[PDB]
RNA sequence: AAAAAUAACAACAAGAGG
RNA sequence: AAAAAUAACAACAAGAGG
């Protein structure tokens, strides 16, 4: 647990315009709005839902430095 | 009868391209997709209600430079997604590409290096080139049809500029810029819509700042739209009109046969 | 936790939101109601949609939390 | 489970003919014989078990509602 | 587990052959051995174990009874 | 915990040519050097690190136990 | 997690170029630089977060032992 | 060696037909999956253990008014799967549409509206006959095997009616249907099961109930068996017996070189 | 590009509108296929060398009594065939049809009777609707495209005709021959190349003679071009010039995107 | 021989719109320059050559009669 | 041609309404107005000349006797 | 010529059903009334007279010889 | 000429031909009898097939020519 | 009487002609040679057609007798 | 006639294959190993005698004369 | 009971591997049709006893220049046709196809331009791609059933190739190449036979002659034995032995259930 | 009603149903 | 390399090969 919230935090913080990849190969692009355990919101024109079970991975587009 | 109008122009400059009467006609034409190509300007410029038009939604993409492009897009319809940069480096630092994703299509505006400013320019738009081909060549596998409203400063081939026989080495009349477009349009399978509707030249989207391409018609034809070819039936009228045109590019109004929607 | 609050704010306003299945399968429909493990999607016939075979769900219109 | 059991039990109880669409996309008609906490039996022909971990969603044929 | 363990139990005693339908879409087919919380041994040629998180069904050939 | 690790160490003491078949239906032939819950080492050239969550089945290539 | 943490220490430490596999098939490629729990930390010419119930196997280059 | 029968026979309400002695007869027959067609009874109606043939399994799809549709299937093995109506709303609530499902071929009553009545009947029919080939053309990625024992209620061509001059205008032998027709067994690959082996005119299923057109043999064929075209060779004997009627229709009885299994 | 010119005009008299400037405005427009319909003059008055045009092929077909019709035919390009009349009664003595083969398509054109002088020119209107559907009945079953340049005389939606409550009862908008059309474009399933390029109205192609139709824009849209399916997306310019008119009518030009070879 | 060469010599005379129907159905609009015992001259925008063995039928479209 | 030109000769003093079947299965009607060795004149709204090698049969409406 | 004529006169003679199949394949069953070298002539219904030329079988029903 | 010989050869052998019409249908039988227009061939009754049908006869075992 | 000298005549100048079958095939070529039962069509190799085959002859150039 | 003769016996002399068209539209193709006034007879694998009254066109597979 | 088995083994000159010893491997397998691709030899050459088998016929198509193409196959049974070449010049002139037709079936060799060689092959090879693709959407029509023996030269599938990753910029393996191969297979229909029996890796045909890629199996899947859909039940046992092989490539030895005739 | 199984698509803004 | 056979399209300006 003590590696991924500080993560998401990171890629909050910056507002930086990530990719979170699914795990069917859908890319979904947008700003993390906020997330717990279970979900990661997603900030595109509309604001989604997305549950972790089917993430993949979360990559950014500019180089983040973590605390 | 559907009918979907993209207006794509390359404006120089939307301050520049503004104090001419860019927002007062584009007001008027209850256009469906705007894209506007080489803004110069900043997310925080266009912000303010001068550059806003009411009742459209505006997306844009500046670069970190905002002196060197940028691009943007209106829509009063809000799309299902809206995506900034091609997934390289020479791309995303310069706002050379955004790409709205409505269901069962997506309208892309795309901004290209001019390449005539040095040689390092040149070389700099064919990387930009080489892996925009190979960014096409991943999405050729996609369902989802896509629009490409691209000024690409190059031409396809011998009949499209005029007094073509001492243009063969300057830049933007390559041969491997030329190359490029014949693959493309090639084994690549893409289309335009300028040529499903006017199979001809002599109707251009490029004139340098001098009296003698105003009159006696120096032209370059750049703003073009690539299409999957799974929309190249649709496409009913294309319009490049001259005199009306607030910067050195000519606007291109299209009308398609697509029902656009959420 | 944002998961039932964002579900119970789907609900309360009756919102035509679109579930997303981890294949591709798109889903529109109202919430009935939701647990741990399921949501309930009312339609022409009211379905559940266990959780674990969720990858998104979208609202239509723009909503805040 | 507070709500996954009075809606397996009433299609259990009024014998309302099932489509279980898997996580693969296969449908599978039936009716619910049994269900445990796990897996549930439905039965067209030969009763067959099928874990809840592979069932994307549960539909019925005839809309039927919760008590 | 109310209604886990007897079903396969009963495959198992009876030694009803048996065929497992994977979450790919797999058809295995054979004898059930032994099983626990977690796998299911499978007799063919070669016994196989198969974890139960990728089971899809388990359809026997002769129905079985509780 | 139970059946299994009686039997992964069995496939590795008396070194046994095990093809794991995963979630998506890909074997990978070769050997066990060593487990533990949710990892499975399989040895070739080059050791790889298998998830146990993606795993389908082992098939061994001898008959064993 | 009593032979997990080790391997991926070792394979953390020495910065073997690894090809990480996904549940559907694809493959990532870069190097390991954290690990938690829950997440791997890839690293590319950007830096993702991989999550580990999307992982199937992870391939070093260069066959390394265990400490 | 291997042999299959299937018998395909309907029969205008199940009820009159067994009163016509329908299960003495399909007793003595030795098939192995009969497929009726226009049951014209629930399914609550023919667990009675009057219908109930012995050594069949007796698998039945309802209407929702039970007088104007139903289908039943009477199996010697217990198939794998028992599925019924198709997904779109002229098959599914009406009750035209059950299929078992076997070891490597798949066998499907199929139930059509006969178009007779009048001009609804006949939107009905054209509505059936597009979207039932909607669900033909996603049929062909799959490989189990299908045998579509279908009474269609329409001619294929000039020798499946008797003076198709005067009969160009009845529903049955129209244009639009003869196109469904062969577009079904023409373009899609499907095999009409009684024209694989006997290549001969003067076959017909369906009469009126006018005596003087049973008297000279005013007859029409309105009930196919539609084969996948993997089962195309196997088909040894398809016979129309012209004596022994238990409705309208007569029976369809084809024997393949298939082996049925679980 | 392919590019075919096809122009259908309705003059009214060939010299009232040659009075006006028909031959030397259609002598610079090289095109394809020219369609003079109610041409109200015989063959040999078309022999006038006055007539004859730049390179152009005349074929001409008259009326017993020239004035009730006549179409005519320009064409630069030598066809395979050219015909004339239907093949009934009210086709043949007026000079309504003349049909050039050329390879792979056809263009034929077409007069129809107006309809408004007197109710048995209404009923001889129906009468050659009803054999005209006939003969296009008859038709489809061939392989090559047909282009019919007709004046129908019939408006086919509630989309096509200004003044809409009181054109109820009106020869030109009545009920079965707005049915004919809406089964020709409906169940028979023909095209309309006048709104394959623009699926908008408020463009008529004839004025009454009066001064509130010709300034207040009184028109009704008569002059069509009917094409069979497989020519219903090479259709690219279809325009009616208003001022520059030689009758009643509006002259009609269009481009498709084919190649017309002998 | 005693209808025929009457009968195309009354369709040579007046130019009638003849039609020759081929025994494959062909339809032929025309007018007949010549003929002989074996072969028809057909006059279009070409001039056609019809042999006599595959003529079904030779039907003109405005009635005429034979002396 | 000894026994199809007093059949051909009966159809047309009766005057018959035949139907003539062609050899690619055309059905065309009419009245036989005359016959040659080689045509035969086949009398309707227009009187076409229909030739003998492309008829298949020629039937009668009513029946006759020679 | 030499041989088809005592074979139609025994299918005239014994009053045999036969069967003509014409040259584009269609078959015209009933029984031969008479026949020249150029026609024959049969009935089910009503009499008719079949060219020679299209036939191209003359198929009986039950098995006759020729004298 | 080369008619006579080979139908003779066909005959006399008692050679199972195959004959193929001019619109594709083939004929299985022996050749019984032929004449300058027919030939009368046997394989349930016998049936009479004008030449100006025939399209080609093969036979299944080759022959030659005396 | 009437054929050969039009077969002549469009065979001496090599009008490049269709010849249409009782099929429908038609075949493009010029005439090289005729007798009272074969014509000779060459377009890439010279081919022989029987007469009671052909349908029409037409020829592309409009020549004259 | 005069013409036939002289090219199908050039065609048997130097043993060109041959695709002959018949009227229906099959092309048998083989060699023309004798003929007469009204018969051709080819080989392919077995020979068969083909009426000239079906054939529409003898095509050589490769030039002559 | 019945049976039947096809040997299509590639032999890359038929001189250089009976030296080798493939006639006496041949003759002691029991095949019915053997089918060989790529000759390398005239049918003049093939006419001598040492080639012969006993108790099967030998027909041979050749190439022009021999060294090109060159296809061969043995017959147990006599056929009832052996017709060569497509129809087209890239088939015929280089002697690529031979066709031996049964009394239900016939059984076709296939050749191909190889494109290993340069551009000018892979050109070649796209063309005839393109052509039989053409020639298939012909054939699929027909009422024959077809077993096209076809040494094609492309892998259709990732399985069908080791190491993939680096193969997909060699011939054999592109994306134009395994979009053919999806074509063929996947909507027109045809069936691999060597796929129905057996769906497990490491089945290979071709191995390059540097020996590292030999011992350890670095090999490519180029043969096929390609079914008409009437023939994918019948289909047994499909396998290409390893271990004894006469040239670069393996034989492919597939058993059906068909009883071949005459 | 489901391929006894693709040593593996740096990735299908998503097939009302692989 | 060919439907042991469409009681019969008032009619396909014509499938370089049905």
Redesign the pocket.
């Known amino acids: 647990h003590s590696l991924q919230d500080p993560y998401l935090n990171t890629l909050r913080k910056e507002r930086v315009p990530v990719s979170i ?2 795990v ?7 700003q993390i709005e906020s997330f717990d355990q279970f979900v990661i919101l ?1 900030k ?1 024109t ?1 604001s ?1 839902m ?1 549950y972790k079970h089917a993430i ?2 979360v ?1 950014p587009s500019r180089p983040v430095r973590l605390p | 009868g559907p009918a979907m109008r993209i207006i794509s122009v390359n404006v120089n400059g939307i301050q520049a391209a503004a104090e001419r009467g860019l927002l007062s006609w584009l007001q008027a034409q209850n256009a469906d997709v705007i894209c506007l190509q080489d803004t110069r300007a900043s997310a925080f410029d266009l912000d303010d209600p001068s550059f806003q038009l009411d009742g459209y939604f505006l997306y844009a993409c500046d670069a970190e430079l905002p002196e060197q492009g940028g691009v943007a897009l209106y829509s009063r319809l809000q799309p ?2 809206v ?1 900034s940069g091609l997934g390289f480096e020479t791309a995303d630092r310069y706002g050379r590409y955004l790409q709205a ?1 409505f ?2 299509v ?1 309208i892309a505006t795309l901004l290209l290096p001019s390449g005539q400013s040095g040689d390092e320019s040149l070389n700099q738009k064919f990387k930009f080139m080489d892996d925009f081909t190979h960014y096409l060549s ?1 999405q050729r ?4 049809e896509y629009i490409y409203c691209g000024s690409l400063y190059v031409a396809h081939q011998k009949m499209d500029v005029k007094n073509w026989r001492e243009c063969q080495q300057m830049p933007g009349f390559l041969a491997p810029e030329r190359a490029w477009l014949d693959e493309v349009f090639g084994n690549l399978g893409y289309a335009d819509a300028l040529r499903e509707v006017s199979r001809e030249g002599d109707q251009f989207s490029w004139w340098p700042d001098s009296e003698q391409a105003e009159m006696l018609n120096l032209g370059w034809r750049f703003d073009y739209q690539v299409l999957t070819p799974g929309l190249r039936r649709f496409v009913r009228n294309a319009k490049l009109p001259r005199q009306p045109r607030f910067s050195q590019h000519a606007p291109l109004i299209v009308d398609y046969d697509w029902q656009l929607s959420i």
Request: net charge positive.
């Open positions: 990849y699914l069917n190969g859908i890319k979904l692009q947008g997603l595109n509309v989604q997305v993949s991975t990559v | 299902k997604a995506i994703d269901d069962k997506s991943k596998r996609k369902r989802r």
